[PDB]
Amino acid sequence: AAQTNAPWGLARISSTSPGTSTYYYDESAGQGSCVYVIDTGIEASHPEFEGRAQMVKTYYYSSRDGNGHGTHCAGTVGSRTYGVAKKTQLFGVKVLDDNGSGQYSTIIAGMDFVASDKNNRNCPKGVVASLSLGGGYSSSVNSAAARLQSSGVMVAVAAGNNNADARNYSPASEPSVCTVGASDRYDRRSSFSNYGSVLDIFGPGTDILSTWIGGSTRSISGTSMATPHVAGLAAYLMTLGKTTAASACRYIADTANKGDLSNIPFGTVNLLAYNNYQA
Ligand SMILES: [Ca+2]
Ligand SMILES: [Ca+2]
């Protein structure tokens, strides 16, 4: 399958070189897999989700996405026009309020919830969790992410937007999950992107067009945008049977475009997510 005039991020992860505009992918499109989006919620009624999204848990007064952040991330995972895995199932967990903030105790509870909730969902091809959030270092938050990964879920987390070493941020600093840096359309490290030895992979993160609340769309930037590219790619690869939840991050690194990025500090991997699609 090919999507013409795709968002540049979708074209980039299906190509070995920058500057293309077609998203090449296999028609299975991640059907049979499930992605939990742990964020501000998901506007499940958006036409771009085609009824494949639902809220399962909120820790606030409503389950509505009053911010837009979680709806944007979920759209990059698996909306029809802006998503990597266009046929996956999307589950929303609202651990952030409508200002984009949340206490660490709530974020930890949200991760423990996903580890248990997956056992009563029909996800035959595997389960993924996308966490476009973070803060200062906390061993309790890192531990919750490790538990979720250990329970059999592919955990993808943002490296953070501080232009610093991600070792001082959580859950980005947890080694056992998949920490995602951001790049721009000219194969440069995004100027805001964190770096360091804890990073596993880079994904497109600057000027990412995706769904927004009110049934609309908009373009924003962040490692929050790179993470759902990798979470979506994981579910796409799990549906194809190429990898498992326990080894998805390593498989993606092994099969990534190597050495294409510039402004990568010494000690940080130069690896860009890539789907290796061949018609
Ligand atoms: Ca290349
Ligand atoms: Ca890792």
Query: C-alpha distances in angstroms, 38 versus 97, 166, 253?
Result: 12, 20, 23
Give the ligand with the smallest distance to the CA of 247. 2
Cα–Cα distances in Å, from 98 out to 17, 59, 94, 147, 220? 38, 12, 9, 27, 17
Binding site per annotation, positions for Ca(2+):
16, 175, 177, 200, 260
Let me know the angle formed at the C-alpha of 141 by 140 and 147, rounded to the nearest 5 degrees: 90
Query: Does the annotation mark 98 as catalytic?
Result: no
The enclosing domain of 65 has a CATH number of 3.40.50.200
Q: Considering its fold, how many domains does the chain have in total? A: 1
Q: Resolution of the coordinates in A?
A: 2.0
- Between CA 72 and CA 248 the distance in angstroms is 23
- Run of H or E residues at 23: strand 23-24
Q: How far is the CA of 267 from the centre of ligand 2 (A)?
A: 14
Give the CA distances from residue 149 to residues 94, 108, 144, 157, in Å, rounded to whole numbers and listed in that order. 19, 13, 9, 11
CA 126–ligand 2 middle distance (angstroms): 19
φ, ψ dihedrals at 149, nearest 5° = -60, -45
Farthest CA pair distance, the chain: 48
In terms of residue numbers, what domain contains 129?
A: 1-279
